């Protein structure tokens, strides 16, 4: 009967997206960015 779980540092930032952690806030915007580029499927409308 163990939880097994972990948590114990305190971070300065983390990419929810993927979840790296970066020095500073300009760091991981500027990283984020490959999230944020992706193409839709496409004109499929109707
Ligand atoms: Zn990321």
């Known amino acids: ?3 097994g779980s ?3 540092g305190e971070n300065p ?3 929810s ?3 790296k952690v970066f020095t ?3 760091n991981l915007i500027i990283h984020q960015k490959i999230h944020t580029g992706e ?3 496409g004109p ?3």
């Open 1 to 3: 009967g163990s939880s």
């Open 6 to 8: 972990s948590g114990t």
């Open 13 to 15: 930032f983390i990419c």
């Open 17 to 19: 997206e993927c979840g």
């Open 24 to 26: 500073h806030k300009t």
């Open 39 to 41: 193409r839709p499927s």
């Open 44 to 46: 499929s409308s109707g």
